[PDB]
Design brief:
The complex is a heterotrimer of chains A (100), B (275) and C (10). Chain A is an all-beta fold and 100 residues long. Chain A has strands at residues 7-12, 22-31, 37-42, 45-46, 51-52, 56-57, 63-71, 79-84, 92-95. Chain A has a single domain, classed as Immunoglobulin-like (Sandwich), CATH 2.60.40.10. In chain A, the strands form 2 sheets. In chain A, strands 1, 2, 5, 6 and 7 form a 5-stranded antiparallel beta sheet that branches. Chain B is globular and about 65 Å long. Chain C contains no helices and no strands. The N and C termini of chain C lie far apart (23 Å). Classes of the chains: A mainly beta (100), B alpha+beta (275), C little secondary structure (10). Chains in contact: A-B, B-C. The interface between A and B is medium-sized, with 27 and 32 residues.
Chain lengths: 100, 275, 10
């Protein structure tokens, strides 16, 4: 079988402004097979009220999911997406960069 | 503009215990309007867009009946495919199917398509002319001989050319306020002093719909790909899309770079320039 | 609107 490793973007729904509530997105795509673990982290710790889109896929059969949660960006809180998948020896953690 | 209706089915066997996970999602253009998930509590086709909630109980009953019967056919398929490929019962495997129809800006039929994959690879697909099949390998060949000798393509064509287009038109009407609406990208440029000598310009396109878009940099009115980075278009989470493109540039030379944005919601392309 | 239950198995 085919095994394709997830691409990851972490970003906010709206322009990030400290003190203003917003949505924190983790968009995983390009992956196969479909079983995948995605957490959103605040300062290294699992956020617990995290939802996701329904599983779909692109033309090349690779899957995509959006995980999101409500958050309030802050000057010094650190947010990240943590992803595991068979294609990964170890959980991948990608830090949210508000510029991106 | 042009339109489509599509369905995406995914079925994943669970050798540990129980029966395959089955997920269907339906889209009009880039708008998901239904879903089914065999693990969810409702065991019903559920709405995902406000305009389909206008369909009454009969619609939801019928879509539920069909989607549950579809899940069963995929369950059978997973068993057959395991045998075609001589696989053990110990591994998890995946079927995917996507099919749908396109209509032009006049709403006349343009094309239909049905595609099937096993374990993430092409397996069998309908041809453009909706009349015969294309098999990727010798297992899919076995399937294709079956489906040709039994003229299975005629029914697929009847659906894709017929019922798919008529219901697509019905949704386009019912969901006019949004489906026939175009949201032009909201654009701006940011500026990140990378280092002493080089700066990164980032051209942003936000909250646009549909997802199709082109972002392009020019330097002095010529296309520029060198030192460029373009991220994959991504869902905002509210039904619109986001994308950006960046270029690295000598500090002080920002003005010679332009960002050009094409999108269906734009009467002319936009041009952005850092000043 | 989904197609009816007419698909053959592979």
């Amino acid at each position: 079988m085919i095994q394709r490793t997830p691409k990851i973007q972490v970003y906010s729904r709206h322009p990030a402004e400290n003190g203003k509530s917003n949505f924190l997105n983790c968009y995983v795509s390009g992956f196969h097979p479909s079983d995948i673990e995605v957490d959103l982290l605040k300062n290294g710790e699992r956020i617990e009220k995290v939802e996701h889109s329904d599983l779909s896929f692109s033309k090349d059969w690779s899957f995509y999911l959006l995980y999101y949660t409500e958050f309030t960006p802050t000057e010094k809180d650190e947010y990240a997406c943590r992803v595991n998948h068979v294609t990964l020896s170890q959980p991948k953690i990608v830090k949210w960069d508000r510029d991106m | 503009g042009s339109h489509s209706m599509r369905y995406f089915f995914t079925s994943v066997s669970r050798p540990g215990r129980g029966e395959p996970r089955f997920i269907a999602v339906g889209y009009v253009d880039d708008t998901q309007f239904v879903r089914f998930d065999s693990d969810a509590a409702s065991q019903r086709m559920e709405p995902r867009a406000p305009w389909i909630e206008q369909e009454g109980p009969e619609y939801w009953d019928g879509e539920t009946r069909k989607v549950k019967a579809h899940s069963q056919t995929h369950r059978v398929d997973l068993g057959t495919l395991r045998g075609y490929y001589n696989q053990s019962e110990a591994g998890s495997h995946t079927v995917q199917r996507m099919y749908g129809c396109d209509v032009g800006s006049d709403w006349r039929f343009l094309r239909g398509y049905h595609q099937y994959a096993y374990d993430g690879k092409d397996y069998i697909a309908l041809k453009e002319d909706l009349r015969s099949w294309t098999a990727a390998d010798m297992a899919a060949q076995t399937t294709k001989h079956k489906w040709e000798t039994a003229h299975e393509a005629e029914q697929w064509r009847a659906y894709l050319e017929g019922t798919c287009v008529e219901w697509l038109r019905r949704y386009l009407e019912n969901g006019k306020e949004t489906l026939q609406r175009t949201d032009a990208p909201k654009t701006h440029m940011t500026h990140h002093a990378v280092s002493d000598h080089e700066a990164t310009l980032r051209c942003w396109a936000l909250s646009f719909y549909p997802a199709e878009i082109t972002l392009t940099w020019q330097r002095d009115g010529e296309d520029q790909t060198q030192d460029t980075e373009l991220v994959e278009t991504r869902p905002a989470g509210d039904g619109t899309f986001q994308k950006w493109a960046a270029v690295v540039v000598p500090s002080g030379q920002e003005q010679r770079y332009t960002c050009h944005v094409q999108h269906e919601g734009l009467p002319k392309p936009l041009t952005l320039r850092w000043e | 609107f989904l197609p009816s239950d007419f698909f053959p198995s592979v």
